[PDB]
Symmetry: C4
Subunit: 308 residues, 4 copies
């Protein structure tokens, strides 16, 4: 019972390219990889510079006079020379001097490595408006849930506390139930496949409406609430995880929050209203108590729905 590590189907007896999605950012993290790539490139350039300054035409410390390039003080000085050149700072006193064939070749390759390294930086991630870490999920869904008589014939709706700038709302159910069934000669397909959205059936979801607050209508003979309901199904339950689908301009990215809301926590309602008016007009400012809605401390342990 998880989300990342489910879909269990395969064993026998058990029971450079980095890129991919792993190139991202974690707020105060994941820039360390970029900075270390930077410093390794810089040190590579610096060590090449020191070795060649040991073996350059003007040699170390300009033994020939009129140096082909201002030789570095030491190996660390060559590191600093590399960083100076590539970072587009360019003092000149310690940098290249009058052109020299080998010096010309190296400096043009250094210009090349500089421009493509700047390209490496421009390959910075854009974890931005398109790919944020704080999801627009300001919709408080519910808490310990409710059943009630549902107007006798499965009529109610779910709480929604959407504040996504009061706009950008359009959803559907999609979803899928789960239970290990049986099938002839197959692997029994441990899946309901029925996808019945029975319950608070009030018809806003499949209807082309801005904010689907209700769920599509699923008539009886799919739910065990023919006769006797509430506690008989509240006690007997495994997973009634409720997941909505298809809000953000597409059904794919959407949001797949678990929200188990199992029948154990759908006990008898018990959320009358803490509002002092219950119908007119309240805040003009903000929400206060989130979910409390739809009590039913009236239907006892036994509650017939359709058979009566």
């Amino acid at each position: 019972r998880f989300v990342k590590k489910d879909g269990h189907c395969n064993v026998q007896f058990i029971n450079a390219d980095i890129f991919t999605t792993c190139v991202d950012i974690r707020w105060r993290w994941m820039l360390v990889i970029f900075c270390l790539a930077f410093v390794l490139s810089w040190l590579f350039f610096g060590c090449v510079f020191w070795l060649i300054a040991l073996l350059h035409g003007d040699l170390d410390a300009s033994k020939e006079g009129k140096a082909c390039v201002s030789e570095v003080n030491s190996f660390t000085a060559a590191f600093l020379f590399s960083i100076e050149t590539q970072t587009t700072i360019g003092y000149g006193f310690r940098c290249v001097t009058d052109e020299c064939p080998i010096a010309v070749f190296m400096v043009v390759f250094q210009s090349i490595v500089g421009c493509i390294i700047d390209a490496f930086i421009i390959g910075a991630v854009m974890a931005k408006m398109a790919k944020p870490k704080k999801r627009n999920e300001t919709l408080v869904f519910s808490h310990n849930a409710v059943i009630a008589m549902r107007d006798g014939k499965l009529c109610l709706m779910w709480r929604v506390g959407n504040l996504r700038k009061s706009h950008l709302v359009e959803a559907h159910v999609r979803a899928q139930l789960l239970k290990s069934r049986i099938t002839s000669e197959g692997e029994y397909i441990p899946l309901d496949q029925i996808d019945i959205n029975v319950g608070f059936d009030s018809g806003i979801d499949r209807i082309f409406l801005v904010s689907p607050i209700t769920i599509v209508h699923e008539i009886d003979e799919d739910s065990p609430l023919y006769d006797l309901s509430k506690q008989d199904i509240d006690n007997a339950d495994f997973e009634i995880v409720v997941i909505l689908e298809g809000m953000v301009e597409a059904t794919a990215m959407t949001t797949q929050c678990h929200s188990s809301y199992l029948a154990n926590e759908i006990l008898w309602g018990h959320r009358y209203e803490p509002v002092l008016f219950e119908e007119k007009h309240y805040y003009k400012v903000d929400y206060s108590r989130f979910h409390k809605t739809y009590e039913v401390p009236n239907t006892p342990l036994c509650s017939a729905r359709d058979l009566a």
Copy 2:
């Protein structure tokens, strides 16, 4: 009766991460936050530079000779040193000198802070073609509205003054009406939920047509215009806010302009035509008077529609 502060459902007795959507631009605004972040970073670097120049190996004003770094004149000079270095200007006379261990460490971290700060700039917002502040809403909808006999059986259409480059037009109704109804044992669901698009029913909206100018057909028994219409419903009205949905490649961003057009301002039509031809061909240049269309100073206070 608002748009930003509606959906009133919850009280009990009342009655660093910035990011989010608040990282945006307001034309001649919201760049001040970026510039102040810049200057605070720059001053932090400068004050660190001044303190370390007070405590560097070459100390203040190069008391050791052959300075590890050209020491700044003062604290403000250290501020300018920081800005000089990070902004990739790099004079050199006041900047770093022959490499020094602590100087090497600080300057490499300064290169790091420079490259990631450039990343901070590249994290500039792109409030552009994708996210503009001037919405493509050149469609003049209407003004004080009209009723007429609607060809007896709810047949008319609404004015549209679309000039969105004469293209990029495809819409639908969606929408939803509102009124505080009652329901058994529930919160009465103060919502119509019917979503009847009754009125100028002429059938272009739901039909797969480029520019839906009309509205879908809603036959009688949903509108109080069985017998007696026009003024009886014009006087008795609360909110007939007309909102279209789903134009810009999706039903979600769309446009949700109010356009109340309540039955009080649907008085008797009174827009014959100011055109001199009324049927042939007019401008080749631009619109002039927007909305004036569809008079009806003929149907009196009493106007039967279907019952007759």
Copy 3:
């Protein structure tokens, strides 16, 4: 009869913010506006620098000694000073010297103008994969069109020469016909509104199929081909512009190429097949002759379709 300048509805007696869509590129154009904005900003900075160098604390040519800033040679030298500083080049010999209060203020504002101008550059347009100038419209539609008997009951299809990487194909008809009709008391609505896709009705378009090559089925009583067809409707025609809709992940951007294909150029078919095999397998390389398909030099001037 146009595309940019149609929708003629309004006259009476006639008969800084730039942004918008006008911020774009035209291949070898529209970068001139960016470069001129650049140079005007640069000249503004340079002229301010020259005037202040005339009125600075160290005055022109450092009349005070130990100049607050290396004064420019002249007004053009101040222009070059500005360009040097902002473009993040930073020599130093001609640039700022030991810090000075007014010099400190000006140089920090210059750092500000530099960073926000770099922001102006980063506000470069991205006329790229998302917004290209070369549309993926490699589909050769047709030429002088064909009618034939259409299997008696409007059965044929249109040519398609799609080579959009052999993928990314999913379309529909949508569309709309046009003719000046009449209507009671209205403006007669000079529009067909019928949107009948009569003709090569073979049923792939509305069916959820990858590449809709045919058109949806429109039975007779909508086309004048009850009895007598081909030339009687070929001669009498105004505009039969054929436009497909909804290919590129949405019905809105799509493609609205005219492709008039009027009944005058639907004369008798006359495209048998220039293929040497006509059924098996041809190129493995590329297309050759585009459109030639579906002759019918057999149906004479008179051609009954349904009445017979």
Copy 4:
């Protein structure tokens, strides 16, 4: 029988703008074009600089004294001068000197070419999250396929090994079959056009469900399996290429992998189960053997399905 070079329709007797899609990257390729454009621009600037230094006001090697610009050592030195200036490095000792009219003009045009060339770099491709080279196609479809009795009335499903982060799954069939049929007076339309998804008909595909594993229901009279099946259709087959459509937020980009799975490789099933449990719960880690599922070494060469 291909994908890139199909759609054979046209011969007669056969039988600067680069941009387009060809501006992309191939991992360790396609940056060479960018670097060569860079170096050609740099060499153009350098050769112009050398020629003008030969013909400048201060002439070669500053024959006038107080040079308008520090003249380069040679033609290669002019190349390096160009690269130095444009790459925003800016030493100064070899670079421009006190302003000179012609020198002013050239250096301002050089600033222009520098800023627009930086624009050329910023026109770097973004072959990234939106346009990756490694497709999210971790779904193992199947191998040598199976038929079985299909519960008598075409009831089974296809294997899916999706691991696309266990989410982002929503598909449909679309597709199209192919066979050279005949038609009256037309080109015979070598295409089935039926698009019958007959086979493992179990109804999840067209149903609005998260992961469509099955295919839509196509009853008999469309498949030759009235009486006698399995081997009679397994031996007689040309192309039964199975392609799914519409997963990645749209039906257009989707995935069009061939997966021929022709009836020759649908021989008798022969994949019982290598699982040791076959129904409960296996890995919590990863897949092992991919496809092996749905044996049927029981139906002989002759196998009636519906007629019996």
